[PDB]
Every structure is written in C-alpha cells, then in structure tokens.
Amino acid sequence: MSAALPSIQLPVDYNNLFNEITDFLVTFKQDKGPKYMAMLQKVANRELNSVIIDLDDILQYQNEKFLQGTQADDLVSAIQQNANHFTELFCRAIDNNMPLPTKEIDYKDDVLDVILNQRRPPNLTRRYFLYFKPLSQNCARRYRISSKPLSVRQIKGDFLGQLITVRGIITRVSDVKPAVEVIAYTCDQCGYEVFQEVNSRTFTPLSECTSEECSQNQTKGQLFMSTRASKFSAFQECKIQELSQQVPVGHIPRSLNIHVNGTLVRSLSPGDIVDVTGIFLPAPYTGFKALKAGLLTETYLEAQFVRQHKKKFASFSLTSDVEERVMELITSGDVYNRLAKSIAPEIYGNLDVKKALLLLLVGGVDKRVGDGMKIRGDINVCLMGDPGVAKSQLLKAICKISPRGVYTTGKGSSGVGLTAAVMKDPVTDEMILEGGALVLADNGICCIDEFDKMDESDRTAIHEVMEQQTISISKAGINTTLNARTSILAAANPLYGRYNPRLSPLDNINLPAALLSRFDILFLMLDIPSRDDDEKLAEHVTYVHMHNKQPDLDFTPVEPSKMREYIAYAKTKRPVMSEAVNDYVVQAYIRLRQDSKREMDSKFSFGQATPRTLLGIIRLSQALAKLRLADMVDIDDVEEALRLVRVSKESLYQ
C-alpha cells in the first residue's frame, strides 16, 4: 500500500553522516595525543561515566574541510534539529572504535567491567553516558546564533526538540532514582538470555518462554530476570519558573518541566539562575479524556548541561589566571575599605556598615570542641534607624551579589513560608518537604525588612537561629531538628519614625534585648540636618540619577563575580590567634564591661556588653586575618574591631 506511507526524500544522508562523525572522532588533535582519544583511553581506564561534546570544534573541522576545499557537509544545521536520533548514532560510532585498557582489571575496580569482560541490542554494552553542551555565542560570532536564553512563555510550538537554551529558576526537583533502559531476562532451561526493551513509562513483562531453543521444543521452560545484568540509568525531573524582567506587562508567568538522566543530576539545586540547554520534547497525554479532540500531548525537555552565572562557594579551585585576578586585586592595596566602598555604591557613604556587611558575608571561623559540640563562625547584623535614610538598597544589592540569597517581607505568608512544608511529589509517591525562606538558605545569606512588623512566631524562630543553627518543629509529620546554617540581616524602624533624642535607644526602639543580646552588631542610623553635607549628598544623588554610573572617582569598584571569587578564596583559610592579642582582648573586654555597666545605666545607654560581644570581636578579628590571608592574628586588627563597635552609636550623642 503506497497510499498509506508514500515515498518521499530529503537531503539527509546517513552514509556521509557516519563517516563525517567517525573521522571527527579521531582527527581531533588541535586541543595523551588526540585528546578526544586520550579521553577514550580514560574511558578504557574507567575514569569517567559520561562523554563530553564540544561543537565549536565540529565547526572547526567543517572549517578544515572548507579550507581544504572539501564538501564540508554541514550536520550541525541538522543536529540542532532531531537530536534524539543523533544520540543512538554517536553511541554506535564510539562503540565501533573504543581503544583498549592500558591498565588491568582487578578485584578493586568497577564491579561491572569484570562482567563486561566475562561475557566478552548493543545498549547494555555501553559503559558510557553522553551529555552535550551547546556553544557560547561568543564563538558563534567568531566566523559567524541558534539558541539564545529563552522563556517559559516563548516556546512558539514549532521548537519541539530543536536545540535550545532556557533560563529561569528551579523551584522543586525530586530525588534521583533508577529506571530501566534494558531488561535482562534469562531462561531456566535454555540457559540463554532475552533482551526486553522499554522506552515508555511502562511495559508488560515477558513470562512465557519464547526462547530460541524453546522455539524448537515442545516444553517452554519459564524465564525470569536479573537484578544486576539488567541495565539501568537514573531519571530526575525539574521545574523552571520564569524570570521577572522578561514577563510582559500585567502578565502572570507560567511553568514547565524537564527530564534528566544519569550523570548531571547533581548539578541542580533550587533557587538559582540557570541556563538549561537541550531539547524540548513530547510525551503521551491528551488532557483528561473529556475535554479532548485527539493527538494532544503533555511534554518535557531534555537535560544535557548546566551553566549558572552564580558560582557556589564549593567551585573554587585556582588556576593560572584566577590566582592572577586575586594577585592584581591585592596588589593595589587599601583592599578592606576598597571592598566596603564597592559594596553597593548606589547609596551614599556609611563605610562602617558596608564593612559590617562584608564581614557578615565572611561569617567567621568554624571551631569544633571535639567533645560533642562546635561553635559557629557565623554573623548576625542589624541596622536600626529612622526612615528617610536609605535602608533597602543594601539588602537588594546583597541578594543580588551573594549566592544562596533570600529576601522576605515582614508579614503575609510568614506563618509557614519561613518554615518547613509537607508535600507529595509529582513524579513519585513520596512525602517530601521543601522549606521556607530560610531553609533555602544554608551556608549562605538572608535578608529581612520591617522586622518590627513581623509576628511573635518569626521572633521565636530567629531567636533560635541567630545563636544555634537549628530549627525545631513539633506540628505534624515534620518532627525535625533541621539544619539552617544561615546568616541573618534584618531591618525595621523605631516607633515614631524619627528618633526621640530625649529618650534612649533602649526605649525608643521596639525590640527586646532579651533577643537583641544575640545581635552582636547594631547600628542606629538617624538623620539630622547640616548646611554642608547635604549639598554634596544631593550632588551624589543627582549624578547617579543623571546617569546610573556612580561618581567618577579615580577608582573602579568591581563585578560580584570577581567579588565572590575573592570571598571564596578567603573562605579557604582558618587562621590562628596568638596570646599577644588574647591578653589585650581580655583587658578591653573587662574595660567595656565595667565601663558600660557602672556608667551607662542612663540616657544613651544600651544594655551591657556580653560574652557574645567578645565572641563576635573574636570572629571578626579572625575574618580580618582571613582577609589579609595569613593564618595568624595581628594586634593591628582588634583596634578596628572595637573602633567600629563604639563607632556604631556615635550619632547618638550629637
């Protein structure tokens, strides 16, 4: 019947496809030996589990063929299409030619390679996954595209399976789990194997003996399956949500799903900028069987590669250029106050507080008791002060630059959205939990605003957090003692908006010191006129509102990429405290204690300095040492600590 399924043809030609590929797979020497083949030797060494695909190199071999006058025979123009077919062709091209194990197999190696060599479709002979990654357009513009960062909303239908890069944010991914690709069915009697293949969600097993010897047999002895011979590879899903600045006007953005497998499942965590790459693909759903017209499709996308403009702290390792970055950074000097200058220059002055935020980012130093306890190298900061003066530019710059960052309001969904949830998972029956604003943060930063407007509950929780990095819950299923490891930064205003200079900060302010004792730092940022300072204030404000570019100082404050770079490298040390500084610190503690107690029980008097004050002095001195990048402490730092401490409240006296 040529009516159904009639003939038709295209320029696609698989015969040259395979030859082009497999010539490329071996002609690579431009960037051991043919390093692609050396990597294959590594694969023979069982060094990796997933092959890597660069594509500007494929462009470059097409350039080779071009420069030599050969029919370059472009496939990328096709591979950008229909990628799901190319995958089981590339795998065949490699299985065709895998080099030999330069090392020997032994009892201490992958337990799979032995079975490989014991029995030494083709899918179960594959000891290698593949995960692509597309070009960065910086190279596509070299010599002259296809896949730009795109939306949840801008699919346009026709982009099913075409090569693509989407940005957005991951809300919730389930846990990694295994899934068949090929069955291992063995015969009781024939002693031979059967390869039942599935690609669907589902199948129906093969029970009666259709074997090849049982074919020529009356009796049909039953077959069964394996738990190790049967191939496997994992399967995990993730949901993007759309970026704000690209939502059109008044429009509620929408959702999307992706599927991942195998190796790259560990490179995804919720809350981040991302550029997923891959291909958008269909699957079998039609709505739900009444609101239908046929041929309908639920759908998904393929994961093959992850880049994110936010580099977490545990991806740090030096090289022959980033160490140069840190060098030329440190070379200029004035590095400390330069940093605290470059922190959010959009807003004016108060270097003392920019510096305190920098130190909040440093956190401190972790120390373990070795007797069943540790103590946090962690910071908690506050900036009490009247309105009018800038307050929020700070927190937004913070969560702009710091990773693992979080903003919340004061009231609204503070009941549980700062806390642990309970939820069933889509892709698998299981009772998962995702947490509030805080728990998305850990070994990272938060920010809060209008603390005074929040509930007593948020106070009950944060009173735990600032000192102890746990959370305790006794509501339902969730009975945890959950780990936070977070760094608090709130803000609020006093009771009357502007200060009461005839009342104390201990009466003017709304919060109790039963909590605020935990607040190692506290600024009081209020405003009184002056004929001269506000002139150039307006100069600053007006020049920034004139063009976003900050004042044209002989100075270049620098990107947060480089800043998180330096923070991460300074997070690597763990310096030491001498006794020469210890004694001086002890004396300053006793000074401040007796002084503040006997003297400051009065007008401008806040409470009393504490052990926590001392512990914080210590942590911050450590951080200073971490910034100078020496493993010990100088006496030249504690002076800055206590300076900044008694400086925090200087404007209480004017």
């Binding site: 068949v180 969600r201 190790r228 698998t428």
Partner: protein
C-alpha cells in the same frame, strides 16, 4: 579452577583462606592499624559458642583489613555478600568440624549436622547516606546511621507451596523458585490424569516473616540545600521486635531496587524502580 558466572569468587579457596585467617588472627589490627597481652582474637568466639547452641555470628571488616590474606576477601564479600555468605555459612561448619577433630565430646553431634549458620558484618566501611547510591553501586554491603519513625506489621510469604489434589487421596508439595510458585496443574498422571485438577490451602503452607521500617537519615555531611528523607527497607525473621521508635541506630544492609504495579488489576509496570534496602545487621 572453580568460578561463578559473571563473578571472580571461588568457593573452596575462600574456604581455605577463611580458615587460615580464622586460625590466624591475634589482635593484628592493634599492630598494623596503630601502636596499641592476649591471643587469637577470633577463635575464642568459636570455642565458646558450641555448648550454647546458637546459629549466628558477628564479624568485622577491619580484621580482614588487618590480616594478610583477607585483603581481597574484603572487596568480594563487599560486591557479593549474599553469595560470599552462602559460601561462608558452609566454610564455617567446615571449620567447626575441622576444629572438633582435635576433641572428643559427649554426643552433641546429633545437632550440628542438622544446623545452619549465618554471619553479620557490622563495623564496615562508611557510606554517605542515600544520595551516593547512583545506580552503579546497587546491591552492595552498606552502612548507615539514623533513627526511627514508623513500624509495620508482619508480612508472611509462601515458603512451602502445599497443594491439595482433588482426588486419589493424595497431597502434593512444591517449593519456591526465585520467588514464585508454578502450580503443577496435573493430577499425578499415574494414579489419575486430570491435567488441571488441583487446589490450594494456606493453613498447610509454610510462611516467612518480613517487616518494614520507616527511618530518618542523620548524616555527618550534607550538601548546599539539604533536608530529611524517609526510607523504607526490609528485615526478615529472627530479627523481629528489635528496632522501633525512640532509638538512634547505626546499621548495615544492602541497597537494592524493585518495580511496583500500576494497579491491583494487571501486570503493567513502571519505568522507574522504587528503591529499598534489605537488612544484614543492626547496631
């Protein structure tokens, strides 16, 4: 040479090396591990236990790591624990009666030949929770540390498939074959030939005991953004009524996989295999 398919595990060589390590282990790990009187660390267990009639035994990993001839045994009990232990349960009776040869005894020999034996590797190489178990390393000796939430009741399982013929005053019997039953439809052709006449009774058959336990995982390290998980597993008979709510636990077992049905209605299954753990020992 003797060897298993897809495997590098000898029975009798394992028995010999087992026996030689067993006759030779004298606080070696004090010596080779560290700087730290006594003699023949293990052998006292095996001398004492006989008069008390017990078919169990515990076992470290380090004492293999200490003795010379056990370094390769480590990676092999590791990979093939139920197989290496189907060996050692035999090597143990072998060593038993190779050690009784130097002794004359009252007739306790009516039992040990009828006996079984089993082992319990407890203090083993550390494992990092659950996330580590990408599918490369399924079905392997494993260790964990956490606490308890929920306990189930007893799963029984057919262990002797009794079978009542309908006629000829005859019973029938048949056992489980990698976890199934293939009812003999026939009627014992000789006496009577009715090729599908037979019945089934439960009150005859032999039942196993299995239990499942919900557990909360309590690592020593976690990644950036972590939170609890709740895992199920399977213990089997002679371990029941041991671990319950109110206990922290260090544990061992084997990580494994299994699919589930789509329904109570037909055999159509899931591409993704629910995971679990079978149990080897609890601390």
């Amino acid at each position: 040479l003797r060897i298993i398919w897809g495997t590098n595990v000898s029975i009798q060589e394992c028995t010999t090396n087992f026996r030689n390590f067993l006759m030779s282990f004298k606080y070696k790990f004090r010596k080779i591990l560290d700087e730290r009187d006594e003699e023949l660390y293990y052998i006292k267990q095996l001398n004492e236990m006989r008069e008390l009639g017990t078919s169990n035994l515990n076992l470290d990993a380090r004492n293999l790591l200490a003795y010379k001839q056990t370094e390769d045994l480590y990676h092999q009990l590791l990979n093939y624990p139920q197989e290496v232990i189907s060996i050692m349960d035999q090597t143990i009776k072998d060593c038993m009666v190779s050690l009784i040869v130097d002794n004359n005894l009252d007739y306790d020999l009516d039992e040990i030949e009828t006996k079984f034996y089993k082992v319990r590797p407890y203090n083993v190489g550390s494992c990092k929770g659950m996330r580590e178990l990408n599918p490369n390393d399924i079905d392997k000796l494993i260790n964990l540390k956490g606490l308890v939430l929920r306990s189930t009741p007893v799963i029984p399982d057919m262990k002797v498939a009794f079978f009542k013929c309908n006629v000829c005053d005859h019973t029938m019997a048949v056992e489980i074959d990698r976890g199934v039953i293939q009812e003999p439809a026939r009627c014992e052709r000789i006496d009577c030939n009715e090729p599908n006449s037979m019945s089934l009774i439960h009150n005859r058959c032999s039942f196993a005991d299995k239990q499942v336990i919900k557990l909360q995982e309590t690592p020593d390290f976690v990644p950036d953004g972590q939170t609890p998980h709740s895992i199920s597993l399977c213990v089997y008979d002679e371990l029941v009524d041991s671990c319950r709510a109110g206990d922290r636990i260090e544990v061992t077992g084997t990580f494994r996989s299994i699919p589930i049905r789509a329904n109570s209605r037909q055999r159509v299954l899931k591409s993704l295999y629910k995971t679990y753990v079978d149990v080897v020992h609890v601390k």
